[PDB]
Homo-oligomer: 98 residues x 2
């Protein structure tokens, strides 16, 4: 079962992001945050830190009480279709509730 | 239950696309194609043709036998979160099989 863990991302010019990593067990599949341009995340391990490279993001709007907000979904490098699909399903399941 | 129907899209400079519209009953929710920049689709009705405006796309890679391929998911203008989530879940369900 998919879990979520707050995780820091970084891209060009040292711009960082905070977001949710979606993972299993602990293997990261994807990262959701509020900015474009992130290239990698610093992923907890024991340990310690593993750098996980990200694919260019999927921007998508969700409705919110303050109006539409743009989210950015980043799949991890080399992720397979089984896991890409699980990530999309998990995000779909979360988005439909809010 | 969500259905898919081949549908033509168009953007700046008259560039067109062919893609799959995801819909119910017949209310279109989203459009998946192979190019960026599409702004609207020409959506079958009886009828006839309704122009449906698209949000800027979510680019996402899927693995294929010829290597990774970039797809573009466009949600329709004003789509609510219930339907956005259903679309993401449907795409997740399709992507995990291939």
């Amino acid at each position: 079962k998919m879990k979520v863990k707050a995780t820091k991302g970084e891209g060009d010019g040292g711009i960082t992001s905070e977001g949710n990593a979606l993972y299993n067990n602990a293997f990261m599949y994807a990262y959701v945050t509020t900015k474009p341009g992130m290239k990698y995340v610093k992923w907890e391990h024991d340990s310690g830190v593993v750098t996980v490279e990200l694919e260019p993001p999927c921007r998508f709007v969700i409705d919110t009480p303050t109006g539409p907000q743009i989210k950015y979904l980043y799949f991890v490098k080399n992720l397979n279709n089984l896991r890409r699909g699980a990530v999309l399903g998990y995000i779909g399941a979360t988005v439909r509730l809010q």
